[PDB]
């Protein structure tokens, strides 16, 4: 038969679903959350990424959310309720320089499965486009797993290329909706 290496799509470990949040106050938060499309290969990822707008070009109050097929971009989802997020705080000047660069590095960390065995703990990621300052976060399934959370946050910091002086905080979803850092790297 034919060597599949000449015609086959490069498959990912997980199928990923990209979501979009359009800020509307007349509707509830969940009503604004909409699904864009699903992909489970490398080519289909770039087929989606190339035709959508960058995070810097969105309106204030819009979110991109890339999660595993089956997990919704909210804390009340089974996979999310017991975990938390590695938050990256950006300023207004980092929208031009860092925002689109950090988000695509974040996207490649998810689909590329860059955290070894602890890539299974990863639920997804979401970029917040706000006028007061942009935010990027990687969500995990369990905040109690110390070894899992610490590895993801360390390797994620190394991928983005953040200086050692910059300190980022992991905060759980249960503490955010009731903020304090459970871990720092």
């Amino acid at each position: 038969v034919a060597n599949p290496e000449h015609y086959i799509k490069h498959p990912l470990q997980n199928r990923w679903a990209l979501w979009f949040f359009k800020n509307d106050k007349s509707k509830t938060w969940q009503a604004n959350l909409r699904l864009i499309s699903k992909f489970d290969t490398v080519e289909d990822f770039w087929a989606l990424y190339n035709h959508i707008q960058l995070s810097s070009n969105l309106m204030p109050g819009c979110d991109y959310s890339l999660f595993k097929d089956g997990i919704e971009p909210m804390w009340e989802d089974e996979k999310n309720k017991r975990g938390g997020r590695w938050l990256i705080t950006l300023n207004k000047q980092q929208r031009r320089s860092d925002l689109d660069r950090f988000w695509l590095e974040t996207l490649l960390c998810l689909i590329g499965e860059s955290f070894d065995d602890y890539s299974d703990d990863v639920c997804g990621a979401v970029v917040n486009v706000r006028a007061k300052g942009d935010k990027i976060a990687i969500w995990t399934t369990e905040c109690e797993n110390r070894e899992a959370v610490t590895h993801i946050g360390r390797v994620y910091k190394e991928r983005l290329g953040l200086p050692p002086k910059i300190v980022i905080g992991y905060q759980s979803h249960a503490d955010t909706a009731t903020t304090k850092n459970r871990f720092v790297v």
């Binding site: 689909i111 590329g112 499965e113």
Partner: peptide, 14 residues
Amino acid sequence: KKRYDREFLLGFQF
């Protein structure tokens, strides 16, 4: 099981 390098993935952009 299925893992990729960042520089391998960037080559499939165009």
